[PDB]
Amino acid sequence: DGGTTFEHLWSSLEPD
Amino acid sequence: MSQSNRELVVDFLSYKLSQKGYSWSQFSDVEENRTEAPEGTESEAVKQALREAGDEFELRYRRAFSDLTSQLHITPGTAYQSFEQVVNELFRDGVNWGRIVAFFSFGGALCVESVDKEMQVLVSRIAAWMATYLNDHLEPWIQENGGWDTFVELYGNNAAAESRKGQERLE
DSSP states (O other), rough: OOOOOOHHHHHHHHHH | OOOOOHHHHHHHHHHHHTTOOOOOHHHHHTTTTOSSOTTTTTTTTTHHHHHHHHHHHHHHHHHHHHHHHHHOOTTOOOOOOOHHHHHHHHHHHHOOOOOOHHHHHHHHHHHHHHHHHHHHHHHHHHHHHHHHHIIIIIIHHHTTTTSSSSHHHHHHOOOHHHHHOOOGGGO
């Protein structure tokens, strides 16, 4: 997994 | 949250006006007071958590929400009901776990433009309506994990909130 905190967060959070 | 999440809005609008190298809280002068309701805990770290992350994701959606706020062009006497219509839609697409920092992005883009229109009085009104909505529909639903304190958990372990004391050595 990426574990890049913000990048991963908003990647999964973007398509709700 | 009530006043805490309201001052969260105030500094967040300051961070938006920092695009210009400016703050409306300079006019308010309350950057000296250093209140902001941080509890001296970790609820302080909320604004920094929403700053780094919220503004990171924002950039793409920032120009997109600039095109939203182009419709919400803040003219002399714009009814906030137009913003309330966008906030209405915002709730229907979700209870706003991430769309709530995007709620701060809409009102933030509005407050950049309304200072730009010398409607800094409308900025303090936008901060009022934002704070209203926050304690109205969002506050229980987010406060379960903080809503914003989730971002705080991922970015800081509140290890700095432990070391925030520091004063144990004085004894």
